[PDB]
């Protein structure tokens, strides 16, 4: 809605699941995303990357770029 660009859509969509957060927790994807989706994603998004992060945060923004862009080809 307020954003659109394939990669931006996933970030805006993930932000909603993480509850207005620059990162998402593994447990959140398990209860917010099909158990199978949380496990697969929890692997893509590296270990978040913020200043006031938390003990167990993940960055879906890094994973979004890989889904629509992985290695040059």
């Amino acid at each position: 809605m307020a954003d659109t660009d394939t990669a931006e859509q996933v970030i805006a969509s993930f932000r909603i699941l993480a509850s207005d957060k620059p990162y998402i927790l593994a447990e959140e994807l398990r209860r917010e995303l099909p158990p199978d989706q949380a496990q697969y994603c929890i692997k893509r998004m590296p270990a978040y990357s913020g200043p006031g992060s938390v003990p167990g945060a993940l960055d879906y923004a890094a994973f979004s770029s890989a889904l629509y862009g992985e290695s040059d080809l």
Binding site: Q9, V10, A12, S13, F14, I16, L17, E32, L33, P34, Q37, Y40, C41, R44, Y60, S64, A66, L67
Partner: peptide, 23 residues
């Protein structure tokens, strides 16, 4: 309705990368 729509986008995007998974 707003949150469910976001999950559809994340799930749809997740299935895209999964399609690249052999059997």
């Amino acid at each position: 309705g707003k949150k469910a729509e976001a999950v559809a986008t994340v799930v749809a995007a997740v299935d895209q990368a999964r399609v690249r998974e052999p059997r």
